[PDB]
Amino acid sequence: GTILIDLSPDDKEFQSVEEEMQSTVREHRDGGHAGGIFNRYNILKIQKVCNKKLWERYTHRRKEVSEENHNHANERMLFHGSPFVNAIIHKGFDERHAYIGGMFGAGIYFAENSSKSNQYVYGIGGGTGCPVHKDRSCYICHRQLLFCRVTLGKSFLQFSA
Amino acid sequence: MAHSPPGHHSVTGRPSVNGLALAEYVIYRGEQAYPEYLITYQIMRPE
Ligand SMILES: CCOC(=O)c1ccc(-c2cc(=O)c3ccccc3o2)cc1
Numbered sequence: 174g175t176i177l178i179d180l181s182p183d184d185k186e187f188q189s190v191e192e193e194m195q196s197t198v199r200e201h202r203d204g205g206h207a208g209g210i211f212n213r214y215n216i217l218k219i220q221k222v223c224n225k226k227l228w229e230r231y232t233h234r235r236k237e238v239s240e241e242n243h244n245h246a247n248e249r250m251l252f253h254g255s256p257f258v259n260a261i262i263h264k265g266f267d268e269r270h271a272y273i274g275g276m277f278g279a280g281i282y283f284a285e286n287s288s289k290s291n292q293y294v295y296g297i298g299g300g301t302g303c304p305v306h307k308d309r310s311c312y313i314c315h316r317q318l319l320f321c322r323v324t325l326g327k328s329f330l331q332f333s334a
Numbered sequence: 335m336a337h338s339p340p341g342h343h344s345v346t347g348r349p350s351v352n353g354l355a356l357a358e359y360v361i362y363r364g365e366q367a368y369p370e371y372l373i374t375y376q377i378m379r380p381e
């Protein structure tokens with residue numbers, strides 16, 4: 174059911190997304206062990222993901238949340254990095270994409286920092302790095318992230334280190 | 335997959351120590367997220 178539509182780098186939708194990606198890079202306390210050492214990205218491509226059935230599933234659940242939270246879905250756009258990106262774009266997020274040992278419990282995790290999501294592109298802690306060179310800091314291999322629409326509704330606030 | 339705290343639909347991880355770190359979020363239902371954009375990229379080696 175999924176189709177991918179390529180955005181032109183001249184489209185403002187491309188530019189608005191690229192800017193979100195670039196401006197939310199930060200330094201990480203691991204000094205780059207998991208995600209690599211970098212201040213910015215070379216964006217090679219941005220594609221819009223279109224799936225009718227996955228969209229209606231999202232919008233149906235978004236209405237339920239909104240109605241339980243003073244008509245406020247509390248919808249954000251957030252980053253997600255994962256070895257499962259290909260399964261996610263075809264079949265949607267489920268319990269298989271959960272971070273079972275995450276600090277806030279076994280769920281699906283999203284970041285405001287693109288660089289934080291980048292730490293999981295090759296697996297937890299960056300795994301063993303890119304498939305071709307076994308390098309968590311590979312400057313050659315192509316990486317993929319998702320920029321997702323996420324319904325937070327009433328969110329439990331957990332302060333943390 | 336676990337459940338959200340009773341009365342909540344998600345968790346917000348808010349860094350209290352690092353000022354420069356933005357928030358992280360968790361949902362416990364797959365249908366509360368839609369993967370809109372697929373971004374292909376390389377990280378770049380600093381100068
Ligand atoms: C073997 C696949 O590993 C997972 O279960 C897994 C774990 C975490 C993530 C993931 C992906 C993220 O984008 C992310 C963002 C903020 C905080 C934590 C995050 O964690 C993706 C997949």
Ligand SMILES: [Zn+2]
Pocket residue numbers: 303304305306307308311312313314
């Ligand atoms: Zn590589």
